[PDB]
Design a protein around this ligand. Structure first.
Ligand SMILES: [Zn+2]
Length: 638
RNA sequence: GGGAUGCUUACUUAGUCAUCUGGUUGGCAAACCUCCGCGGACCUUCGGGACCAAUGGAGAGGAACCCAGCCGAGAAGCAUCGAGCCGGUAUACCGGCUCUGACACCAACUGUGAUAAACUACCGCAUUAA
RNA sequence: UUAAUGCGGUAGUUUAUCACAGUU
């Protein structure tokens, strides 16, 4: 439903000092950005301080100021579709009129309804937070264009974080009310009122509570507070079994959070007449709001990528999205890009709705498959049973192949060059030996993005981070007051943070060109959690090193954006085995160990069918058959 | 890597990899930072939890942070020798072309809810000395 | 009660995990 699949794939680059301006004035120019950058973030933070009190109450009579909150956050549904200036323009005047920053008081607009006109007046007859009072006077010193940007981004901060969450909580609280009210009469066997008694007096807690204090030995040897409560309840497990599941706790009500430089400083939108771009000489016209006439300050940057698919000349920039990571002011060039039409009558958004709200629970996983499988069939122009080209991404460790399926027939499976060396290979050069459930040992740093290589940078930070933590406690710390701060190390972290993030891009890109020679209609994905990452085994007491994961969840979102761009379609199915299941037969191998030994070499052996293919072929051919009715989810969770 | 090499620098060395964020020295300016709060501000197990915050005050370490410097690395404005391709000239000369690793150049940022794992902090039990 | 640990629980500090939704 939402237009999530827009004209994105924005280009961003790092800010570079011009070779011939200065070495200190360049820092003075960044500090010129900094003094304003901190100001706007402080300005928007104070705006939402005075607006959060306009929220709906949901259990109290509707205040006359509630309907202004609805309009100011969601004007598009409350306004006629023929708005003259802008939907954000209407919220600006309403916000201005509600506050004291309206010098003309122009709330008498034809597009403003009666429910909105009186609400704005009722809002002004309320005291402010004494923080916006000095802010509102300060906001009067900006150009209306600045207040145009400032007000609209201030609302968007409140829109999704609070209002949608608060309204979702209303549905959640109604759902919890309906659940708890029915549960009072539907579970009267041992909890008509005793469920409240247990409240007066959590895997470990559940085991101890559902016991007669006999489990306290397990809690102590292998959580004794819950065992004592269970023992006191008897003076037991019969009532604890239902009291815990009652979900007596109040639903998490929306606690508003405020804009900050540390965690989320919004990319300031340098819209029309506020940005410039030059890539023949990579210098950007970065202008602050302080200049009234639009004095674009010239700062060098990294030129346009040579092998980036949409060239600079085919597209026009719309606004610079600049932020502040560390100290370097990175910018973002938002533009448009032409997508490609898909060979279906449906869209990915329809499939998203099915997984999100129609089939959210893990127990409702199988019903999703048949619902999703038949959803595509009528939308297929030709015959999906004979023409639906399919590749199944597996995302292996050393090798990865996508099985090519059209009409349930397997043609061939070929791998990707997803490994980082000075020259790209197909696998890491490891041929030492093979073993079993006896032992394992290997100590050699593979040069690239390997599991051993990513852990190498982690060890170096241990020397630095421990010294930082130790010395910080000596200069002023002189021991439970604090542990450490996020700013101790950023340089090596972002190098490693982008390192894995670029590794995901390597998988993201390689599959895209892998699926372009064959017009693959549908691609399926898995959902794996992980068992044990061997990267960290000795490091401890840090906040800078566990960024060397594989980012399985992020990879699904690169391909989602690229698929609609190239007219491709991707889908994610719940966690089946997909690796302990044979491609041909539905044997459901339960050894779980001899597969892993074969997985090291990239091949496998089947217990039931005897196929001697590769695991990549095995995983991909299964996932392809999961789309068909031949293979389904094991549904062996209970 | 397929050429090697040098001159020039308010350049980069904070896309990754290529044994590799190369190592190292200072910091007056300045930034960073540590304690604070004119104040709010949501929820609350009413104990507290989390965040914003003055065109705001300080103070300090150069452990970090950030500013700056040194060596080297790599990018280029240009130059030297050599080869490939090619023609006019004659068996040779002249001239142009590419001459320099791979990858990716952010679907990105962000919040909330869970999983296993990690140390700090504190308590207690089982096992070790008085 | 002082010293060498292990295992639980709790919070300080995480990260990814899975899921959803915004600026774009
Ligand atoms: Zn089988």
């Amino acid at each position: 439903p939402r237009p999530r699949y827009r004209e994105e794939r924005t280009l961003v680059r790092k800010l570079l000092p011009r070779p011939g301006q200065s070495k200190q004035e360049f820092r003075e120019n960044v500090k010129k950005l900094r003094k304003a950058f901190l100001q706007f973030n402080a300005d928007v933070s104070g705006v939402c301080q005075w607006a959060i009190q306009f929220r709906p109450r949901y259990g109290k009579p509707a205040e006359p100021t509630e309907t202004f909150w609805k309009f100011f956050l969601e004007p598009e549904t409350s306004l006629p579709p023929n708005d003259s200036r802008s939907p954000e323009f209407r919220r600006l005047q309403a916000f201005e009129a509600a506050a004291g920053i309206n010098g003309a008081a122009a709330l008498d607009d034809p597009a403003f309804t009666n429910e909105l006109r009186d609400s704005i007046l009722a809002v002004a007859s309320r005291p402010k937070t004494k923080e916006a009072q000095r802010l509102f006077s300060r906001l009067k010193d900006y150009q209306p264009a600045h207040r145009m940007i400032l007000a609209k981004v201030a609302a968007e901060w409140i829109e999704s974080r609070y209002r949608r969450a608060h309204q979702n909580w209303e549905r959640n609280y109604e759902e919890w009310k309906k659940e708890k009210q029915e549960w009072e009469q539907n579970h009267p066997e041992l909890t008509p009122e005793i469920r409240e008694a247990f409240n007066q007096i959590p895997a470990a807690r559940l085991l101890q509570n559902k016991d007669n204090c006999q489990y306290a030995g397990k809690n102590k040897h292998s959580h004794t507070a819950l065992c004592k409560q269970y023992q006191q309840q008897l003076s037991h497990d019969e009532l604890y079994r239902k009291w815990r599941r009652e979900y007596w706790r109040e639903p998490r009500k929306p606690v508003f959070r405020y804009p900050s430089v540390k965690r989320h400083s919004i990319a300031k939108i340098f819209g029309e007449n506020y940005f410039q771009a030059d890539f023949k000489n990579s210098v950007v016209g970065l202008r602050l709001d302080s200049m009234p006439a639009g004095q674009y300050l010239e700062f060098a940057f990294a030129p346009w990528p040579r092998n980036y698919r949409p060239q600079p000349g085919e597209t026009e920039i719309s606004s610079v999205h600049l932020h502040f990571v560390g100290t370097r002011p990175r910018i973002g060039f938002r533009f448009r890009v032409p997508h490609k039409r898909s060979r279906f009558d449906c869209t990915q958004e329809e499939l998203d709705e099915l997984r999100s709200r129609t089939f959210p629970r893990k127990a409702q996983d199988q019903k999703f498959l048949e619902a999703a499988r038949k959803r595509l069939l009528e939308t297929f122009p030709g015959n999906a049973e004979q023409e639906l080209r399919l590749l199944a991404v597996d995302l292996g460790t050393d090798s990865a192949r996508a099985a090519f399926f059209i009409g349930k027939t397997f043609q061939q499976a070929f791998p990707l060059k997803i490994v980082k060396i000075e020259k790209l290979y197909e696998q890491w050069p490891n041929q030492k030996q093979a073993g079993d459930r006896r032992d394992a040992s290997s100590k050699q740093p593979r040069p690239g993005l390997s599991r051993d290589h990513v852990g190498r940078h982690l060890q170096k930070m241990r020397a630095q981070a421990s010294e930082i933590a130790q010395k910080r406690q000596e200069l002023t710390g002189t021991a439970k007051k604090a542990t450490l701060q996020p700013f101790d190390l950023r340089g090596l972290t972002v190098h490693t943070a982008r390192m894995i993030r670029d590794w995901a891009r390597l998988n993201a890109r390689q599959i895209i060109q892998l699926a372009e020679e064959n017009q693959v209609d549908l691609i399926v994905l898995e959902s794996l959690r992980g068992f044990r990452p061997p990267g960290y085994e000795n490091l401890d007491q840090e906040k800078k090193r566990r960024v060397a994961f594989f980012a399985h969840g992020r990879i699904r979102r690169k391909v989602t954006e690229k698929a609609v761009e190239r007219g491709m379609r991707v889908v994610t199915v719940p966690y089946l085995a997909s690796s302990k299941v044979c491609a041909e037969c539905r044997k459901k191998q339960k050894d779980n160990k001899q597969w892993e030994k074969n997985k090291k070499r990239g091949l496998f052996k089947c217990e039931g069918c005897g196929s001697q293919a590769q695991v990549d072929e095995n995983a991909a051919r299964v996932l392809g058959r999961v789309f068909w009715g031949e293979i389904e989810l094991p549904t062996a969770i209970p």
